[PDB]
Write a protein that binds this ligand. Structure first.
Ligand SMILES: Cc1cc(Br)c([O-])c(-c2nc3cc(C(N)=[NH2+])ccc3[nH]2)c1
Ligand SMILES: [Ca+2]
Length: 223
């Protein structure tokens, strides 16, 4: 997260860190046994770390559970990143409480101007890699579709939305992929891509979760 602030330990209880011997992506806990992340974060050998704040120190509240299966959306296209969503079932249910809790899925899509909270342990530099030890937060508004399409002509599908600042300086970045974009207490986006990080006129692009709610519910139901 570039231009963000330290969230404060366990202030984002649904945030998860996907770990394969190092933190590589974020994710959101939607129920005690399932996490939603981005399909481009897929890999085998994933350990889900819940209740985390400092990813390099065990401080208490952490729960490490291995993933039982990861279901990448069947229509995920790695060249366009259309349908960039993935579900991970945990080997055992997490214990929920106030430090580890699920986030609700939306009932409607959000409109441009809605302010959201994006969080993650991704890069905090737009020029260079500086990964933090504690969770960073950023408040960003969803942008209108014309500003999003004028920024990435021909690369935005109806399953994506832009959120951020066209003046640059504040944005999500590598390491934040798979993480949550929460607006009014609902998970509305998943950190997906962008050109560079916090660059002028190049906002972050997020998976539009309201378009996948029936899919998420049907898939969790049949698995
Ligand atoms: C080289 C590389 C590899 C991976 Br894997 C990424 O997810 C990314 C990446 N760039 C990103 C840029 C943004 C942004 N909001 N500007 C968000 C996620 C990103 N993820 C970059
Ligand atoms: Ca820790």
């Amino acid at each position: 997260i570039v231009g963000g602030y330290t969230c404060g330990a366990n202030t984002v209880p649904y945030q998860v860190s996907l770990n394969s011997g190092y933190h590589f992506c974020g994710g959101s806990l939607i129920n005690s046994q399932w996490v939603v992340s981005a399909a481009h974060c897929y890999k085998s050998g994933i350990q889900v770390r819940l209740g985390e704040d400092n990813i390099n120190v065990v401080e208490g509240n952490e729960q490490f559970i291995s993933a039982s299966k990861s279901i990448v959306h069947p229509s995920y296209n790695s060249n366009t990143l259309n349908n960039d969503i993935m579900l991970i079932k945990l080997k055992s249910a997490a214990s929920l409480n106030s430090r580890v809790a699920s986030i609700s899925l939306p009932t409607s899509c959000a409109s441009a101007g809605t302010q959201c909270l994006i969080s993650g342990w991704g890069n905090t530099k737009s020029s260079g890699t500086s990964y933090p030890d504690v969770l960073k937060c950023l408040k960003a508004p969803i942008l209108s579709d014309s500003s999003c399409k004028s920024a990435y002509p021909g690369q935005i599908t109806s399953n994506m939305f832009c959120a951020g600042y066209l003046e640059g300086g504040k944005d999500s970045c590598q390491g934040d992929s798979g993480g949550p974009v929460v607006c009014s207490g609902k998970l509305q986006g998943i950190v997906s891509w962008g050109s560079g990080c916090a660059q002028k006129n190049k906002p972050g692009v997020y998976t539009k979760v309201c378009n996948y709610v029936s899919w998420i519910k049907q898939t969790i139901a049949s698995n």
